[PDB]
């Protein structure tokens, strides 16, 4: 079960640039007997590192690898360009929570100022002096085609790249076993409704008060509903790690008695 890594991380590169593809398996091998594939066709390279000294149009395509131990790696698309500006991306398809590095790369490392970053045609970031954009933690709003524009001898634009940010679980919805306003003494079940679209830790809250902390149970019961229980209720759904947690819209419960 191999995996491809790039020395300069960028999946999109200019013509005449250096990019090295390394086939590495954590189940350790094996070593060197390597099997590199370009557009579903095996290449003459056996070295664990597929080095491209000066990139050209035919070096573009889908890459796959095999290292000693059986298990063909996930396919990675590498694209070589010509032009003035290039929006460089570290990955094309990834799950939310994973960081995303963006780079507005200029031809022959020329100096560019008044740099803009676009997501689906709309500019979202300005940099006076060219700088990299690293989104520490991604979500579904980061999905889409990215571009960059900057000022050199003239205002140049880069070609666009589609980035796919895959959603794990949708933002949760707090559902109550009874409708609001409810009568005092009622037994209420609070359920943090979400579906993993493929371990989840849930927590229940009331305004600022913590009702129940991190646990696998998607349910919480208000044993005997009192007037003091009237307020805004919301839940939080998160991965074991914690990396990713989503809050739910506030659900008001009015208790009458
Ligand atoms: C954006 O990031 C580029 C890549 O950096 C790596 O990835 C980032 C996401 C981040 O994790 C960072 O910490 C990593 O190192 C940066 O490019 C690096 O810096 C140079 C610019 O291309 C380059 O080098 C040069 O500098 C010497 C002088 O010291 C010159 O002689 C030479 O010609 C180069 O100009 C180096 O190859 C590169 N490093 C890697 C690992 O790719 C860069 O800071 C930044 N780019 C911009 C445009 O702001
Ligand atoms: C692996 O598949 C790649 C993608 O299909 C292929 O690259 C593509 O190749 C052609 C020709 O080299 C390019 O298409 C045409 O448009 C350009 C405009 O820049 C002109 O130079 C020519 O008219 C040209 O025929 C594609 O742009 C190019 N890249 C992509 C990303 O589609 C590779 O050649 C294949 N590599 C191997 C080793 O089989
Ligand atoms: C970002 O949003 C969606 C994912 O939430 C992207 O993909 C959609 O679904 C499939 C699978 O990737 C593709 O066939 C389509 O491109 C998208 N749906 C439709 C109905 O077209 C999507 O590519 C991203 N960006 C945009 C601008 O749609
Ligand atoms: C996707 O995550 C980003 C953060 O990575 C959220 O952006 C917040 O930060 C912006 C500017 O950086 C600030 O103006 C607002 O607070 C943004 O909301 C973004 O909201 C988020 N979207 C979803 C749907 O989760
Ligand atoms: C790239 O591939 C195309 C189509 O197979 C061919 O016409 C062309 O000569 C190749 N160019 C280089 C630089 O190898
Ligand atoms: C809670 O969700 C279940 C399943 O979708 C549904 O039967 C029920 O009506 C929901 N509760 C309310 C108060 O709508």
Curated annotation (Swiss-Prot):
Highest taxon listed in the record's lineage: Eukaryota
Location(s), subcellular: Cell membrane
GO molecular function: high-affinity IgG receptor activity; IgG binding; IgG receptor activity
Residue intervals of the Ig-like C2-type domain: 2-81, 75-164, 170-252
Glycan attachment sites: 39, 58, 132, 139, 143, 175, 215
Protein's UniProt keywords contain Cytoplasm: no
Bilayer topology annotation: Single-pass type I membrane protein
Keywords: Cell membrane, Disulfide bond, Glycoprotein, IgG-binding protein, Immunity, Immunoglobulin domain, Innate immunity, Membrane, Phosphoprotein, Receptor, Repeat, Signal, Transmembrane, Transmembrane helix
Membrane side Extracellular: residue ranges: 1-257
PTM comment, free text: Phosphorylated on serine residues.
One GO cellular component, as annotated: early endosome membrane
Annotated S-S bridges: 23-65, 104-148, 192-235
Entry keyword annotation includes Transmembrane helix: yes
Tissues showing expression: Monocyte/macrophage specific.
BP GO terms, sorted: antibody-dependent cellular cytotoxicity; antigen processing and presentation of exogenous peptide antigen via MHC class I; cell surface receptor signaling pathway; defense response to bacterium; Fc-gamma receptor signaling pathway; immune response; innate immune response; phagocytosis, engulfment
Similarity comment text for this entry: Belongs to the immunoglobulin superfamily. FCGR1 family.
Subunit structure: Interacts with IGHG1. Interacts with FCERG1; forms a functional signaling complex. Interacts with FLNA; prevents FCGR1A degradation. Interacts with EPB41L2, LAT and PPL. Interacts with HCK and LYN.
Function: High affinity receptor for the Fc region of immunoglobulins gamma. Functions in both innate and adaptive immune responses. Mediates IgG effector functions on monocytes triggering antibody-dependent cellular cytotoxicity (ADCC) of virus-infected cells.
Protein name: High affinity immunoglobulin gamma Fc receptor I
Shown residues within the full chain: 21 to 282 of 374
């Amino acid at each position: 079960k191999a995996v491809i890594t790039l020395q300069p991380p960028w999946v999109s590169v200019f013509q005449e640039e250096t990019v090295t593809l390394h086939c590495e398996v954590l189940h350790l091998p094996g070593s060197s007997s390597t099997q590199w594939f370009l557009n579903g066709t095996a290449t003459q390279t056996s070295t664990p590192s597929y080095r491209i000294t000066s990139a050209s149009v035919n070096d573009s395509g889908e890459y796959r690898c095999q290292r000693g131990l059986s298990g063909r790696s996930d396919p990675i698309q590498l694209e070589i360009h010509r032009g003035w500006l290039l929006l460089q991306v570290s990955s094309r398809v990834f799950t939310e929570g994973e960081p995303l590095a963006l780079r507005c790369h200029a031809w022959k490392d020329k100096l560019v100022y008044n740099v803009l970053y676009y997501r689906n045609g709309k500019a979202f970031k300005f940099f006076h002096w060219n700088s990299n954009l690293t989104i520490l933690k991604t979500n579904i709003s980061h999905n889409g085609t990215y571009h960059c524009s900057g000022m050199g001898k003239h205002r140049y634009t880069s070609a666009g790249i589609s980035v796919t940010v895959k959603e794990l679980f949708p933002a949760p919805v707090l559902n109550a076993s009874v409708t609001s306003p409810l009568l005092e003494g009622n037994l209420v079940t609070l359920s943090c409704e979400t579906k993993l679209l493929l371990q989840l830790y849930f927590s229940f809250y009331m305004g600022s008060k913590t009702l129940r902390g991190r646990n696998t149970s998607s349910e919480y019961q208000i044993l005997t509903a009192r007037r003091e229980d009237s307020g805004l209720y919301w839940c939080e759904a998160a991965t074991e790690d914690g990396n990713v947690l989503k809050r739910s819209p506030e659900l008001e419960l009015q208790v009458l008695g």
